[PDB]
Design a protein around this ligand. Sequence first.
Ligand SMILES: Nc1ncnc2c1ncn2[C@@H]1O[C@H](COP(=O)(O)OP(=O)(O)O)[C@@H](O)[C@H]1O
Ligand SMILES: Nc1ncnc2c1ncn2[C@@H]1O[C@H](COP(=O)(O)OP(=O)(O)O)[C@@H](O)[C@H]1O
Lengths: 125, 125
Amino acid sequence: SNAMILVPIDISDERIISHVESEARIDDAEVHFLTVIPSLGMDELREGSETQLKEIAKKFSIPEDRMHFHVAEGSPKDKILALAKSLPADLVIIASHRPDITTYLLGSNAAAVVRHAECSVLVVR
Amino acid sequence: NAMILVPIDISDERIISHVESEARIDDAEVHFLTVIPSLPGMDELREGSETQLKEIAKKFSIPEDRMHFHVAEGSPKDKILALAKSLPADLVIIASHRPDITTYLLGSNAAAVVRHAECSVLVVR
Ligand SMILES: Nc1ncnc2c1ncn2[C@@H]1O[C@H](COP(=O)(O)OP(=O)(O)O)[C@@H](O)[C@H]1O
Ligand SMILES: Nc1ncnc2c1ncn2[C@@H]1O[C@H](COP(=O)(O)OP(=O)(O)O)[C@@H](O)[C@H]1O
C-alpha cells in the first residue's frame, strides 16, 4: 500500500510542480494525474487529452514508474472526488484557482474538493 | 488514412505478424478494441481494460503515432461491428477462435464479424 497522491490537471491552460514533487518525495508516492473532459469522437478526445496530460507531466521530477495517467469525462469536481475515493487517494493536490483568474480566492473545483474529499487536501498558492 | 480494426480479448500471438504486415501496406491507422461484456466502478473497469489492452499492443511492431485504443461495453460482436461501421474500418483482423479452444473451427464472434462486417475481414489462423 504505497501512498497515492491525486493531481488533477486542467490541460486547457507551474506553482503546483514543486509541491507535487516535494509531497511525492516524502514516501516515493504514486502520483496519479487526472484530467477531466467536460460533458455536453469520444475515443479521439480521450486520446488527445491523454497525450496533452503526458506532455504536462514531463515537467515534474518524479520517477517514470511512479506516474499514472487518468482521463475522465463529465463534471471535473465529481470525477476528481470519484477518483480520490476509488484509488483511494491519501492526498489531493490542487491549485486554489486558475493562474489567470483572481476574482475568486478559491475556484469552484478547489472549493468542492477541499470540502468533500475523504482525504487530506493541499491547496496550492 | 486506411484504418484497420483489431478486436482483442484481454483475457486471452498469431495475429501479430498479420496485423504488422497489413498495417505496413499503407501505413494504416491500427485501432485496437476490447469489449468488456455486460452483467468495481465502470470507470475503473474501463481504465483497467485500456491498460491491459495497451500492454498487449506493445507486442506489435507498429509506430506509436498509428495505434489507437478503444474500450466498449456489451456484446463483443455488436461493438466490433458498430466500430467497424463508424470508423469506418477498411479491414477487420480477427483470430478464427480463442487459441486454447479447438471444438469450434470458427468462434462465434469471428463468424458474426466475417458475415456482417461491411468491409473486408481477415480471419487469422
Ligand atoms: N477539467 C479539469 N480536469 C482536471 N482537473 C481540473 C479541471 N478543472 C479544474 N481542475 C482542478 O481544479 C483546480 C482549480 O480549478 P477551479 O477550481 O475550476 O478554478 P478555476 O475555475 O479558476 O480554474 C485546477 O488547478 C485543477 O487542479
Ligand atoms: N470481449 C472482446 N473484445 C474484443 N474482441 C473480442 C472479444 N471477444 C472476442 N473478440 C475477438 O474475436 C476473436 C475470436 O473470438 P470468438 O469468436 O469469441 O472465439 P472464441 O469463442 O474461441 O473466443 C478474438 O480473438 C477477438 O479478436
